Amino acid sequence: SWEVGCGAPVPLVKCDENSPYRTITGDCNNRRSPALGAANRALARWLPAEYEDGLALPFGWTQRKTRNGFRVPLAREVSNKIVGYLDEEGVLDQNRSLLFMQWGQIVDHDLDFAPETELGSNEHSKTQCEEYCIQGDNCFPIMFPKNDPKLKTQGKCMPFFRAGFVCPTPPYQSLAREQINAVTSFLDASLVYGSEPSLASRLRNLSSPLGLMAVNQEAWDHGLAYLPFNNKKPSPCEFINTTARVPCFLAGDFRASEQILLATAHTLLLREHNRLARELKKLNPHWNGEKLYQEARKILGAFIQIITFRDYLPIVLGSEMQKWIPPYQGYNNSVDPRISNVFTFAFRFGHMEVPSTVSRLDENYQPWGPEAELPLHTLFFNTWRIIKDGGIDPLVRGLLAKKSKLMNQDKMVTSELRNKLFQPTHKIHGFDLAAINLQRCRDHGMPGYNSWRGFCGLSQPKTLKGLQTVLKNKILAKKLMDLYKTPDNIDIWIGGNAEPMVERGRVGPLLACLLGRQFQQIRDGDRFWWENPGVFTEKQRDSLQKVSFSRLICDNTHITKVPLHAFQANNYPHDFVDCSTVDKLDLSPWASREN
Ligand code: HEM
Numbered sequence: 155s156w157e158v159g160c161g162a163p164v165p166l167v168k169c170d171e172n173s174p175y176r177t178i179t180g181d182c183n184n185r186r187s188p189a190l191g192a193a194n195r196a197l198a199r200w201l202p203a204e205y206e207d208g209l210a211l212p213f214g215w216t217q218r219k220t221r222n223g224f225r226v227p228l229a230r231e232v233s234n235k236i237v238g239y240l241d242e243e244g245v246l247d248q249n250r251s252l253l254f255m256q257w258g259q260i261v262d263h264d265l266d267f268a269p270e271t272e273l274g275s276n277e278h279s280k281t282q283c284e285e286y287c288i289q290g291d292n293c294f295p296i297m298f299p300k301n302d303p304k305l306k307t308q309g310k311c312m313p314f315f316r317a318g319f320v321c322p323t324p325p326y327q328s329l330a331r332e333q334i335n336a337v338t339s340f341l342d343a344s345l346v347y348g349s350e351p352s353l354a355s356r357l358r359n360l361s362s363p364l365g366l367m368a369v370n371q372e373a374w375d376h377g378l379a380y381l382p383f384n385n386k387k388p389s390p391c392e393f394i395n396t397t398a399r400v401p402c403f404l405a406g407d408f409r410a411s412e413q414i415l416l417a418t419a420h421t422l423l424l425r426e427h428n429r430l431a432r433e434l435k436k437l438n439p440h441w442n443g444e445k446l447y448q449e450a451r452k453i454l455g456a457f458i459q460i461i462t463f464r465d466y467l468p469i470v471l472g473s474e475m476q477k478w479i480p481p482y483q484g485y486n487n488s489v490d491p492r493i494s495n496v497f498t499f500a501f502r503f504g505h506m507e508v509p510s511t512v513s514r515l516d517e518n519y520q521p522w523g524p525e526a527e528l529p530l531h532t533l534f535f536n537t538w539r540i541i542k543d544g545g546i547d548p549l550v551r552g553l554l555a556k557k558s559k560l561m562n563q564d565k566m567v568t569s570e571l572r573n574k575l576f577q578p579t580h581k582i583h584g585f586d587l588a589a590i591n592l593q594r595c596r597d598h599g600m601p602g603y604n605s606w607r608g609f610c611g612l613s614q615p616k617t618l619k620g621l622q623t624v625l626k627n628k629i630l631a632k633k634l635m636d637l638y639k640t641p642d643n644i645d646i647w648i649g650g651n652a653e654p655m656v657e658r659g660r661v662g663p664l665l666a667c668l669l670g671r672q673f674q675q676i677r678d679g680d681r682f683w684w685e686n687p688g689v690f691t692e693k694q695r696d697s698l699q700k701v702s703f704s705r706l707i708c709d710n711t712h713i714t715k716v717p718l719h720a721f722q723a724n725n726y727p728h729d730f731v732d733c734s735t736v737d738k739l740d741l742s743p744w745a746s747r748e749n
C-alpha cells in the first residue's frame with residue numbers, strides 16, 4: 155500500500171523561502187514538500203493507473219488481452235464511428251466566441267505537458283514507427299480499421315510514440331508507470347516564461363537592465379513586438395512553406411506555434427509583460443531588470459488566474475462551478491496542487507470546441523482581403539501568415555467576432571483536426587487528434603469511464619439502456635456499446651465528452667467534477683495565488699480585479715473596438731464598445747518609495 159519511490163530530476167532544490175517570487179520550476183511553492191506542483195515530476199494519480207499488465211503496457215497493446223473480458227476498439231475506429239462528421243453547417247456555439255476555445259488551450263499549456271519519450275534524442279531512427287507501422291518499446295502506432303479511407307492514401311497506421319515517464323528511463327520494472335508533467339502545475343504563466351532555468355533565461359532580454367523578454371529582431375507588427383524565432387532545425391513552421399521560410403516562435407512552452415491563434419495569444423501575453431515592465435520602470439526607475447522581470451511576471455501570472463477563475467471556469471463548469479470551486483478561503487498547505495494524469499485528458503474537451511476555419515477581419519470587422527477565411531489545417535505551425543499577411547490584429551478581431559465550435563454528440567471533432575492534423579517530422583496534413591487522444595488515454599494507464607463516474611459519485615451504467623439514460627442519446631449509446639461492449643471499457647476522453655452539457659456549462663457532470671476538483675486544488679494549494687494574503691497588497695488587488703481580456707487587447711494591438719465580455723458570442727458593432735470604455739490596469743499601488 156506504500157513504498158519509498160525513485161527520484162527523476164535534480165532530487166531537491168535549495169528553496170530560499172524568503173523570496174517573494176515563484177521559482178521558474180515551481181519548486182519551493184510548498185514548504186513541507188517543496189517538489190509539489192514543480193515541473194518535470196510524475197503527474198498525480200487520483201486513481202491507481204490501469205495497464206494491460208498492471209505496470210506499464212496500455213490496454214490494446216496485446217491483441218489477446220481483454221479489458222473486463224472484451225477487446226478494446228481501435229482508437230481511429232472510435233474516431234471514425236463516433237467523433238467524425240461531414241457538415242460544418244449549424245455547428246457553431248451561438249454564445250461562445252472563438253477566444254473561449256483559445257483561452258482553454260492557453261490555460262491547458264500553463265498546467266500540463268507530457269512529452270513523448272526522450273526529448274533529449276531522435277535515436278533510434280530505424281525509424282521505424284511511421285514507415286513499417288510495427289509496435290514496440292514506446293512506438294505504439296494508431297492502426298487504421300478496415301474500410302478507413304486513410305488505408306487507401308497514407309499507409310496502414312498513424313505513428314504514435316508513448317509519453318515519457320519517471321524515473322527518466324526507457325527500461326523499467328517494479329511499480330506502475332507514471333508520465334511526466336514538464337510544466338508547473340501552478341497557474342503561473344509558465345507558458346510565457348518557461349518551466350526550466352535553461353529556457354527562462356534564453357527568453358529574457360538580459361543585454362539591457364529593463365527586465366524585458368526578447369523580441370523578434372527580424373520582423374515587427376506596425377512597430378509592435380513579435381515573439382523571437384526558434385532558430386532550431388528542423389522547423390515545422392519553415393516546412394509548411396519552404397518558400398516563405400518563416401520559422402516557429404520561441405515561447406515559455408514549446409507548442410506555441412502549433413496553430414496561428416495559439417501563437418497569436420502567446421504574442422498578446424508577451425507584449426503585456428514588456429508593456430507591464432516599461433510601465434513599472436517609469437514608476438520605479440531604481441528597480442534593476444530582475445526586479446522588473448519578476449514584478450511583471452508576477453502581475454501577468456495573476457491576470458491568467460483571474461481571467462481563468464473569474465471569466466473562463468464559470469462558463470465551462472456552469473451550474474457545477476459552486477459545487478467544485480467554492481469562493482477562495484485562503485492558501486491550504488495540505489492541498490495537493492499537482493495536475494492529475496486524468497485532468498490532462500479531461501481538459502481535451504477543448505478539442506470539440508475548435509471549428510473548421512479561422513478569419514482575418516479588418517477595422518470594420520469585415521473580410522480582411524480576398525482570403526480572409528482559411529481552413530484550420532493550413533494554419534498548423536503557420537507563422538508566415540502572421541508576419542507577411544497583416545500581423546495579429548486581423549486574427550485577434552476574428553477571436554472576438556467568430557464563434558467556438560459547440561460540442562455536439564453527432565458532430566464532435568472537425569475533420570481539420572480529425573483527418574488533417576500536422577505533426578512535426580511526419581510531413582503530411584494527415585493525422586487525427588481524436589484517435590491520438592484515445593491512444594494517449596491508454597498510453598497513460600487511464601481507468602475507464604465508470605471508474606471515473608464512481609470517483610465523481612455518479613451512477614455507473616452497465617446496460618445499453620443505462621448508457622442511453624446517462625448520454626440522453628439512444629444512437630450514441632448504441633455505437634459506444636457496439637464498440638466497447640461495456641460502459642466500464644469506454645475511454646474517459648470520449649466517455650466524459652459524450653455526456654450532455656450541464657446548465658450554463660460546456661462539459662457534462664463527469665468532466666465538471668474532474669475539472670472542478672483540479673482547478674479547486676491548483677488554486678487552494680498555491681502559496682503564490684494572487685488573492686492569498688501577503689502575495690499582493692490590498693490596493694494592488696483592487697487594481698488587478700479590473701483587468702479583462704478586452705483590456706489586454708486594447709493595450710497590446712491597434713484594436714480600438716472590443717466587447718466588454720470577450721468569451722461570450724459578440725457581433726460587431728452592436729456588442730462592441732471603444733477601448734476607452736474599458737477599465738484599465740492601474741499600477742499606482744506598485745509605486746515603491748525608498749532611498
Ligand atoms: C487548433 C486547436 C488545437 C490543436 C491543433 C490542438 C492540438 C493538440 C495536440 C497535437 C496535442 C498533443 C496530442 C498528444 O500527443 O496526445 C494536444 C494536447 C492537448 N490539448 Fe489540444 N489542441 C487544440 C486546442 C485545444 C484546446 C482548445 C484545449 C482546451 C481547451 C486543448 C487541450 C489539450 C490538452 C489538455 C492536451 C494535453 C496536454 C498534455 O498534458 O500533454 N487543446 N492538443
Ligand SMILES: *[C@@H]1O[C@H](CO)[C@@H](O)[C@H](O)[C@H]1NC(C)=O
Pocket residue numbers: 359361362364366367368369370371
Ligand atoms: C533588448 O532591449 C533593447 C532596448 O532596450 C532593444 O533595442 C534590443 O533589441 C532588445 N533585444 C532583444 C533581443 O529583445
Ligand SMILES: *[C@@H]1O[C@H](CO)[C@@H](O)[C@H](O)[C@H]1NC(C)=O
Pocket residue numbers: 394395397398538542
Ligand atoms: C508561401 O508564402 C508566400 C509568401 O511568403 C505565399 O505568397 C505563398 O502562397 C505561400 N505558399 C504556401 C503553400 O503557403
Ligand SMILES: *[C@@H]1O[C@H](CO)[C@@H](O)[C@H](O)[C@H]1NC(C)=O
Pocket residue numbers: 486487488489490
Ligand atoms: C486543507 O485541505 C484538507 C484536505 O485536502 C482538509 O483536510 C483540511 O480541512 C484543509 N485544512 C484547513 C486548515 O483548512
Ligand SMILES: *[C@@H]1O[C@H](CO)[C@@H](O)[C@H](O)[C@H]1NC(C)=O
Pocket residue numbers: 249469658659722
Ligand atoms: C451567454 O453566457 C452566459 C451563460 O452561458 C450568460 O451570462 C448569458 O445569458 C448567455 N446569453 C445567451 C445564452 O444568449
Ligand SMILES: [Ca+2]
Pocket residue numbers: 264265337338339340341342343344345
Ligand atoms: Ca504553470
